[PDB]
């Protein structure tokens, strides 16, 4: 909520002076944060997915989608339409609420932290983080989980390049290397 109001007032005005944008809409805005959790090991144990679903449902506000396998492959021993991973495509109000909660308190709680990767862009301003543990978020109780599982955060923007997209995230006091 607050970071959205901060973005509208403080950030845009900062970003306009950098690349001398003609219009206010030209500034890159954060479209959606997609929290993904390819549990994978759900082939053997079916409940292990439903455990991950509860952990994503705890981490994010909303309940996750159970993504099916797109195509059958023998390397992992999976078939067409088999539930292999969990996902959340959170956007809008709860997105800005989660984005605060990620960068302000969770990212600090990473074990052996130093500085997040600057090179990690797709060549179109869309960022992604790979958190190893679930414990870094304060939602999960310590004596509840019993697996070293994690998720990946995926920040989608309206930017046309990583050089342009880095500034947007950098304006939120985001930690880079």
């Amino acid at each position: 909520a607050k970071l959205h109001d901060y973005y509208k007032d403080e950030v845009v005005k900062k970003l306009m002076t950098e690349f001398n944008y003609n219009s206010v809409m030209q500034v890159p805005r954060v479209e959606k944060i997609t929290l993904n959790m390819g549990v994978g090991e759900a082939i053997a144990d079916k409940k292990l997915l439903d455990n991950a679903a509860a952990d994503l449902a705890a981490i994010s506000g909303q309940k996750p989608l159970i993504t099916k396998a797109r195509k059958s492959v023998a390397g992992f021993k999976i078939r067409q339409g088999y539930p292999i991973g969990c996902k959340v495509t959170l956007r809008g109000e709860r997105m800005w609420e989660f984005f605060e909660r990620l960068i302000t308190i969770a990212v600090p709680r990473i074990r052996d932290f130093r500085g997040l990767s600057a090179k990690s862009f797709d060549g179109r301003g869309n960022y992604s983080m790979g958190v190893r543990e679930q414990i870094i978020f304060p939602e999960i109780d310590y004596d509840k989980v019993d697996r070293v599982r994690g998720l990946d955060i995926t920040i989608t923007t309206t930017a046309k390049s990583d050089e342009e997209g880095r500034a947007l995230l950098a304006a939120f006091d985001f930690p880079f290397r």
Partner: protein, 66 residues
């Protein structure tokens, strides 16, 4: 959002040991207690203290001193 299916997304107060009080909204419960935040974490000083560790010649000179 679809009502019923989601968990209870309630407002809560984060209060770290540093002093930075901060209200947020999440599926935790009543209250929070934190160790570090975006402020007060050693990354701005961490990189300064980490990178400047090496130095072998002075370590020899500290023993001999002549």
């Amino acid at each position: 959002m679809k009502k019923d299916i989601h968990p209870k997304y309630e407002e809560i107060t984060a209060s770290c040991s540093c002093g930075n009080v901060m209200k947020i909204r999440s599926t935790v419960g009543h209250d929070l207690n934190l160790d570090v935040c975006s402020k007060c974490h050693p990354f701005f000083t961490g990189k300064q203290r980490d990178v400047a560790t090496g130095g072998r010649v002075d370590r020899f000179n500290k023993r001999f001193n002549i």
